[PDB]
């Protein structure tokens, strides 16, 4: 259900359902996207819908995602935020590269 | 040692330790800052420095502190609407809560 799509410099996770670990397929996608990213810092935006449960889910998904990225690049520089969207009804994570 | 500093426009809580809540005195400071805010919405940004190892714990601590802070604000100002945001950046040096109006 949760969907991962990416281009050269942007990876977008669109969450669906309950708090989940990443599937084996999602782990591969995130790993495949990071393979060429050794020299990139990462700007991560956790975006949740507008109105505590949703906020908590955004924190927990941010934790999972940090852990996932850190498995590949332990010394990765991350800046990560959590914010409500004006109106999306979607929870998502956007990763942008900043090349170093 | 949790510290509160403010101007008319902005109040910043700098947290010490792992305590989630405030002294009686810091509660009064917050209440005094809110007194001319009855005609305002509020924005809170929880700022969470990055722990090398135990970032899950630090991150959950900021979540919990924001629960308490919103609780304390609404004690004073029951109908206020709060926009909550979180930032955990590499450059973040202190655990703090920034409060602004609108």
């Amino acid at each position: 259900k949760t969907d991962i799509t990416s281009t050269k410099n942007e990876l977008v996770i669109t969450y669906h359902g309950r708090l989940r670990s990443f599937s084996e397929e999602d782990t591969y996608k995130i790993k495949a996207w990071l393979e060429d990213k050794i020299n990139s810092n990462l700007l991560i935006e956790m975006v949740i819908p507008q109105a505590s449960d949703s906020l908590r889910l955004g924190y927990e998904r941010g934790i999972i995602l940090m852990k996932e990225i850190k498995k590949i690049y332990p010394d990765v520089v991350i800046d990560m935020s959590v914010n409500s969207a004006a109106s999306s009804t979607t929870s998502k994570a956007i990763i942008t590269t900043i090349n170093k």
Side-chain angles (χ1 to χ4, degrees), chain A residues 44-59:
Chain A
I44 296 179
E45 312 165 66
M46 306 306 307
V47 188
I48 63 177
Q50 269 274 97
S52 166
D53 200 76
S54 262
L55 177 61
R56 174 62 181 277
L57 266 183
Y59 269 96

Side-chain angles (χ1 to χ4, degrees), chain A residues 20 24 79:
Chain A
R20 259 186 179 87
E24 298 273 85
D79 299 301

Side-chain angles (χ1 to χ4, degrees), chain A residues 70-90:
Chain A
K70 276 170 198 287
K71 283 190 194 308
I72 295 138
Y73 297 130
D75 304 321
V76 69
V77 184
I78 298 170
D79 299 301
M80 182 178 80
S81 61
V82 195
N83 291 276
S84 289
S87 300
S88 47
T89 68
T90 326

Side-chain angles (χ1 to χ4, degrees), chain A residues 11-79:
Chain A
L11 185 137
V12 182
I13 306 185
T14 302
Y15 297 97
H16 293 112
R18 62 168 172 88
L19 181 54
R20 259 186 179 87
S21 70
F22 284 121
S23 67
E24 298 273 85
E25 181 159 1
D26 286 335
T27 291
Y28 157 82
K29 285 182 179 210
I30 293 167
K31 199 200 193 174
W33 184 78
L34 291 162
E35 174 171 310
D36 71 325
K37 304 291 194 282
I38 191 179
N39 288 325
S40 298
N41 303 342
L42 301 177
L43 186 57
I44 296 179
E45 312 165 66
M46 306 306 307
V47 188
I48 63 177
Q50 269 274 97
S52 166
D53 200 76
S54 262
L55 177 61
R56 174 62 181 277
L57 266 183
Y59 269 96
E60 294 291 336
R61 288 164 160 163
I63 284 163
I64 292 178
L65 175 53
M66 287 188 153
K67 291 176 174 300
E68 196 63 25
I69 300 169
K70 276 170 198 287
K71 283 190 194 308
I72 295 138
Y73 297 130
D75 304 321
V76 69
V77 184
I78 298 170
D79 299 301

